[PDB]
Scaffold this active site. Structure first.
Site, PDB file in Angstrom:
ATOM      1  N   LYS A  59      36.686  34.101  56.221  1.00  0.00           N
ATOM      2  CA  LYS A  59      35.429  34.836  56.224  1.00  0.00           C
ATOM      3  C   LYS A  59      34.499  34.262  57.294  1.00  0.00           C
ATOM      4  O   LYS A  59      34.317  33.045  57.395  1.00  0.00           O
ATOM      5  CB  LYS A  59      34.742  34.750  54.855  1.00  0.00           C
ATOM      6  N   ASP A 118      37.757  38.119  58.817  1.00  0.00           N
ATOM      7  CA  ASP A 118      37.004  39.206  58.203  1.00  0.00           C
ATOM      8  C   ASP A 118      35.527  38.922  58.428  1.00  0.00           C
ATOM      9  O   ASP A 118      34.980  37.977  57.864  1.00  0.00           O
ATOM     10  CB  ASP A 118      37.299  39.281  56.707  1.00  0.00           C
ATOM     11  N   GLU A 122      39.258  42.011  60.388  1.00  0.00           N
ATOM     12  CA  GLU A 122      38.787  43.040  59.473  1.00  0.00           C
ATOM     13  C   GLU A 122      37.324  43.408  59.704  1.00  0.00           C
ATOM     14  O   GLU A 122      36.482  42.526  59.904  1.00  0.00           O
ATOM     15  CB  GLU A 122      38.914  42.545  58.035  1.00  0.00           C
ATOM     16  N   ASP A 124      37.811  48.334  56.703  1.00  0.00           N
ATOM     17  CA  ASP A 124      37.665  48.063  55.284  1.00  0.00           C
ATOM     18  C   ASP A 124      36.514  48.909  54.767  1.00  0.00           C
ATOM     19  O   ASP A 124      36.736  50.007  54.265  1.00  0.00           O
ATOM     20  CB  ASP A 124      37.394  46.582  55.007  1.00  0.00           C
ATOM     21  N   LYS A 170      41.427  49.542  48.631  1.00  0.00           N
ATOM     22  CA  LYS A 170      40.948  48.883  47.417  1.00  0.00           C
ATOM     23  C   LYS A 170      40.840  49.924  46.309  1.00  0.00           C
ATOM     24  O   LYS A 170      40.230  50.971  46.506  1.00  0.00           O
ATOM     25  CB  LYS A 170      39.565  48.264  47.625  1.00  0.00           C
TER      26      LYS A 170
HETATM   27  C1  LIG Z   1      35.971  36.499  47.579  1.00  0.00           C
HETATM   28  C2  LIG Z   1      37.109  37.264  48.251  1.00  0.00           C
HETATM   29  C3  LIG Z   1      37.580  38.497  47.482  1.00  0.00           C
HETATM   30  C4  LIG Z   1      38.340  38.144  46.208  1.00  0.00           C
HETATM   31  C5  LIG Z   1      38.463  39.377  48.405  1.00  0.00           C
HETATM   32  N1  LIG Z   1      39.556  38.592  49.047  1.00  0.00           N
HETATM   33  C6  LIG Z   1      37.550  40.009  49.448  1.00  0.00           C
HETATM   34  O1  LIG Z   1      37.336  39.443  50.524  1.00  0.00           O
HETATM   35  N2  LIG Z   1      37.022  41.184  49.111  1.00  0.00           N
HETATM   36  C7  LIG Z   1      36.120  41.929  49.982  1.00  0.00           C
HETATM   37  C8  LIG Z   1      34.786  41.186  50.111  1.00  0.00           C
HETATM   38  C9  LIG Z   1      34.012  41.030  48.812  1.00  0.00           C
HETATM   39  C10 LIG Z   1      33.871  42.092  47.916  1.00  0.00           C
HETATM   40  C11 LIG Z   1      33.106  41.955  46.742  1.00  0.00           C
HETATM   41  C12 LIG Z   1      32.485  40.742  46.469  1.00  0.00           C
HETATM   42  O2  LIG Z   1      31.709  40.582  45.339  1.00  0.00           O
HETATM   43  C13 LIG Z   1      32.622  39.680  47.342  1.00  0.00           C
HETATM   44  C14 LIG Z   1      33.378  39.829  48.504  1.00  0.00           C
HETATM   45  C15 LIG Z   1      36.723  42.178  51.364  1.00  0.00           C
HETATM   46  O3  LIG Z   1      35.952  42.185  52.349  1.00  0.00           O
HETATM   47  O4  LIG Z   1      37.955  42.384  51.439  1.00  0.00           O
HETATM   48 MG   LIG Z   2      37.328  43.008  54.055  1.00  0.00          MG
END
Ligand SMILES: CC[C@H](C)[C@H](N)C(=O)N[C@@H](Cc1ccc(O)cc1)C(=O)O
Ligand SMILES: [Mg+2]
Length: 353
Positions: free
Chosen positions: A161, A189, A215, A240, A264
């Site tokens: 991230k 991402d 991403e 995304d 998702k």
């Molecule tokens: C914290 C990472 C989550 C489990 C997943 N890998 C993820 O990155 N999901 C989203 C981002 C996100 C969505 C909801 C939330 O409350 C926090 C983060 C993504 O960008 O893919």
């Molecule tokens: Mg993402």
């Protein structure tokens, strides 16, 4: 088979550690757990994990919507997924978390009735999936140490991230790469944090760091900017937040906006819609990665894993939401254990109780 009653309840599970992304922070997974009871006694499990800074959905809104859906589908056959979505779409113009909660429970019931693990009803390509694990935003050295820890747990793919500023974000990636070496796959991402120009600048600066993909580098509504990045770097670009449903997927495919798409269940409203997104993408030569919200838990992740294992075109997986949970709200399904291999048993439906 006929739906007798739809039960729903709030689930609030604290996370072992707060997670920070470009859009905000989360410290608790609060979702709606659905249990659809049929006349014959079979009970299907569903879940709606609403991420407010992702879709704007809240737990209270999701709970209220699920109750409306619940009353409207009494008497219907869970296999009539076509009518079930028709009914929900007529009731609400937008509530993917609530629709996913109902949809997932229906598929669970379909599997249980057919006495087959869900992946067998969704394509049957495989019975397991390998997931990456996400590293939340933090100082370079900190993220790097975490990376080493995760690799030790067996993860060969890390989702990094970023998004506070290209300078700092580049530093994060370099530190992580130096710490774990080049045998580990690294996908980035930015969660809409960069301008198209900065995205290209940052991606080019990381050229020798072997980045697997990036991403959603830009704002979700900036499809022109997203395409700009895709067309300016050889690095794979994944959409995304810019792609919630099938209609969005159709738009991105016509425009050639990205190279890969993140699916998702909580963005598209369930397995029924996720299948459509994947089919559209596969037809267009675009691979898909199954993802998740930090708000969902065992149920949402298990359903996603069955779908990902069943479909050949879903070639990547980011299903790590259970890894941060203090506790599991249900029995069976994908474990809270932080491991890359998610093996699905032979239990019918989702194998959840
Ligand atoms: C914290 C990472 C989550 C489990 C997943 N890998 C993820 O990155 N999901 C989203 C981002 C996100 C969505 C909801 C939330 O409350 C926090 C983060 C993504 O960008 O893919
Ligand atoms: Mg993402």
């Amino acid at each position: 088979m006929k739906i007798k009653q739809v039960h729903v309840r709030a689930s609030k599970i604290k996370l072992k550690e707060t997670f920070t992304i470009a859009l905000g922070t989360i410290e608790s997974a609060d979702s709606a757990i659905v249990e659809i009871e049929t006349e014959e006694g079979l009970v299907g499990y569903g879940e709606g994990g609403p991420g407010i800074f992702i879709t704007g959905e809240t737990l209270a809104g999701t709970l209220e919507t699920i109750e409306l859906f619940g009353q409207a589908i009494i008497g219907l056959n869970p296999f009539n997924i076509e009518k079930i979505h028709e009914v929900m779409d007529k009731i609400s113009a937008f509530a993917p978390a609530a629709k996913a909660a109902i949809d997932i429970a229906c598929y669970d019931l379909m599997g249980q009735k057919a006495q087959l693990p869900l992946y067998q009803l969704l394509g049957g390509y495989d019975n397991q999936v390998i997931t990456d694990i996400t590293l939340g935003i933090d100082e370079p050295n900190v993220m790097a140490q975490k990376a080493v820890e995760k690799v030790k747990l067996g993860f060969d793919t890390l989702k990094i991230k970023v998004g506070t500023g290209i300078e700092a974000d580049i530093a994060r990636v370099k530190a992580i790469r130096e710490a774990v070496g080049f045998d580990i796959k690294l996908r980035l991402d930015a969660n809409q944090a960069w301008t198209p120009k900065d995205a290209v600048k940052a991606i080019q600066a990381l050229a020798d760091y072997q980045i697997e993909l990036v991403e959603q580098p830009v704002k979700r509504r900036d499809l022109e900017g997203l395409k700009y990045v895709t067309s300016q770097v050889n690095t794979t670009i994944m959409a995304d937040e810019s792609c919630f449903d099938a209609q969005d997927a159709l738009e991105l495919v016509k425009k050639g906006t990205v190279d890969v798409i993140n699916i998702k269940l909580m963005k598209c409203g369930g397995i029924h819609e996720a299948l459509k997104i994947n089919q559209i993408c596969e037809t267009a030569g675009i691979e898909c990665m199954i993802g998740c919200m930090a708000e969902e838990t065992t149920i949402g992740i298990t359903a996603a894993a069955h779908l990902a294992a069943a479909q050949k075109n879903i070639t990547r997986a980011d299903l790590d939401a259970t890894f941060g949970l203090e506790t599991a709200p249900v029995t069976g399904g994908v474990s809270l254990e932080a491991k890359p291999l998610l093996e699905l048993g032979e239990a019918a439906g989702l194998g959840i109780s």
